[PDB]
Amino acid sequence: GVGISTGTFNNQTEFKFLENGWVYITANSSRLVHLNMPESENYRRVVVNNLDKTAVNGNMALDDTHAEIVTPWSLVDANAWGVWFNPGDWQLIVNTMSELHLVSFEQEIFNVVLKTVSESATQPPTKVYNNDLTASLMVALDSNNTMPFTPAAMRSETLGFYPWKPTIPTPWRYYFQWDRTLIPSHTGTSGTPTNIYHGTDPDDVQFYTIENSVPVHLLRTGDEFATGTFFFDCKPCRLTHTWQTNRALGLPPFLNSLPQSEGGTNFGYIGVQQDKRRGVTQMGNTNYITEATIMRPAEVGYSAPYYSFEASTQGPFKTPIAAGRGGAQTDENQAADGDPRYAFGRQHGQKTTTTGETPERFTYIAHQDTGRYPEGDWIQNINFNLPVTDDNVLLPTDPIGGKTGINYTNIFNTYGPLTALNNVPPVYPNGQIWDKEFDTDLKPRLHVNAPFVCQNNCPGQLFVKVAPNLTNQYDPDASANMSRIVTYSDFWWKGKLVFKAKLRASHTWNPIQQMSINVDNQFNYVPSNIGGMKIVYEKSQLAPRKLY
Amino acid sequence: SLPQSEGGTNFGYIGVQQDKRRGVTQMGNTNYITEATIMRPAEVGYSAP
């Protein structure tokens, strides 16, 4: 009815301990979602153009041109880590768990409130918020995944991370195909390169509408909604990082001269001269056996062009990389291609009392040492004469194509049948939890955005929209915008997300890295005197595991 | 900022200045988020010699 609630708030996290070291983690989230009525009931096809910015020669990387269908619906997206876990729960998970399985997800909407704003014509303006006991909220669940998948975490548009702060949904839109060509240039390039928006290819047009593709429930103030329980099939994630690179794989060389005194400079010596040694190498014409030349079972990580932009039907896009940079842990200023950089606002981690439009940003320096250090790379001739002469070695200090600032590493690629790499580690709080596998015939090995990728399917996107509340003067043959009573809605969204984890075992003598509250970061996990709150980022793969 | 009249010359605009925007990028040393630099799940197609 009207005065009877249709659900209960719940934001607790439960750890149910099972047999054989497994833990059933139940993350409950509950939010108060506020939704204004849409700008216009009509779907729009909007072409966004930034031809002004790109026209400046050498600025092609800043292309934003595209075409998108903008819809009257709003998306309720909970695909982010911060929605489910507070820093303490994440601390427990990372410090104690070794692997994380995604099990199930269900969500529901209850306690729907619809209100109308009546503004008086009094000389001093005033407005009063009445209820509307008959207005409806349209809720559509795309259980069949008939609509384009649009994860909001990539735009920091998921629900809030604070249970006590109301959150808003995101207006839904999806890309409409377009043809666009942009020939790159540089500062000082003469003339105007070909920079053109070509329209649309009819063979690719796709105009989706929620009304035609999904059943839409109408929820009055006394109604409820529940999506039911979906079950994932994603592969297990590891909360452990690998440190062994190719140089640390296998049996080290026996030391014939061990050190005899403590001290940093009292090194040990192998003894056998490098050309008189034993072992196996992939160098069929060289007698030298060294740690750099000795055969290894396979290659850890791979090299790829960094900051490479490739163009296609829709224009240029950065080539993604599956691993971070090398040595970034020693110097953050060297954090570069491959280390995801998250920007977010006051709903998703930034201090809630901050003023201004500037967002809060952080670069994630993954622990795993699967990355590369392109400055230490080099190529040398097949003859392998040592020391290598100038003409027989290509170095990162060598110009390629006549450019002083570009070297061979910028275009080098070593992905091969021997390559081995790890999945992207979870990013708290702003990291995405799951993502949809592509419908291509050959599917990518991993996604750079989510640790869980969806083999068959995973939960349909949930859409909400304030049903139109017409005035008596409605005339559908009028070309003007529909006349609607100012109406908004507030409804409680509750979700339950179920993981399964294994509790880690101490394999080694020494202790391992752990997350701990300390004097330097103490105040990031408590409110300020004026209620300000922030959710700083936390690393997720502290414990090390042996690669080989 | 949505368009207000029909015709090609009436585009839409994202509004937020590019270096003040929000999102996830694989470019750890720049604040610019554009449709060319924003993170995507994976790569469709590939270049070959």
Partner: antibody
């Protein structure tokens, strides 16, 4: 629709400095390439300078190179022209205008391409003179 | 500086052409061309971004005006972008006398 509005033009002593302003109305200023042009009385239209939307690059004519400095403020939604080292030749009416960055191919504009050399909208203008 | 005619004249209701005869790497090259109208004391108005028409016409652009009236008895300017200067350039302007 919104329009531009110039201000700051006036007689000033030769060799001095001044600062012309061009207020912009409408949401397109942040997105538009801005330009300054000047017209000496009964003379031909003379380009002064241009600056892109993001203040990434600036261009001037040799006649004002090293003397004029164009700048913009999206927070104030305005453009400015610092006319340092004023010279007798600066006496003219100065306008601020918008350079058309996109030109549509089809007459209904289903396809667009970048270009330069056409000014879309013009401001009111301000008169500047250089004399003692 | 682009070469533009000093002036042209014609009676009411007739058709006239005002030509811009700049060189290559300039208005007479793949770059765009723009025409503006102005009466002394008024800001120029951009004609071609309805009775008017225009054509780059290879190395020499032309604006075909028609329906000459008391209004439009004004000055007309040609503009383009020059690569040798890498900047916007203008023609000398042309005046129209309507008889």
């Amino acid at each position: 629709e919104g329009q531009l509005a110039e201000s700051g033009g006036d007689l000033v002593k030769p060799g001095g400095s001044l600062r012309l302003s061009c207020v912009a109305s409408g949401s397109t200023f942040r997105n538009s390439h801005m330009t300054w042009v000047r017209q000496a009385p009964g003379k031909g239209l003379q380009w002064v300078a241009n600056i892109d939307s993001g203040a990434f690059t600036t261009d001037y004519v040799d006649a004002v190179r090293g003397r004029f400095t164009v700048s913009r403020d999206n927070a104030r939604n305005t453009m400015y022209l610092q006319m340092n080292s004023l010279r007798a030749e600066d006496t003219a009416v100065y306008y601020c205008a918008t350079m058309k960055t996109s030109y549509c191919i089809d007459e209904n504009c289903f396809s667009f391409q970048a270009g330069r050399g056409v000014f879309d909208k013009w401001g009111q203008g301000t008169l500047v003179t250089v004399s003692s | 500086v682009l070469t533009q005619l000093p002036s042209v004249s014609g009676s009411l209701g007739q058709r006239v052409t005002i030509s811009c005869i700049g060189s290559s790497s300039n208005v007479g090259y793949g770059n765009y061309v723009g025409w503006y109208q102005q009466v002394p004391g008024t800001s120029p108005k951009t004609l071609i971004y309805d009775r008017f028409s225009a054509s780059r016409s290879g190395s020499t652009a032309t604006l075909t005006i028609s329906g000459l009236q008391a209004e439009d008895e004004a000055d007309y300017y040609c503009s383009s972008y020059d690569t040798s200067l890498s900047g916007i350039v203008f023609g000398g302007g042309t005046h129209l006398t309507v008889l």
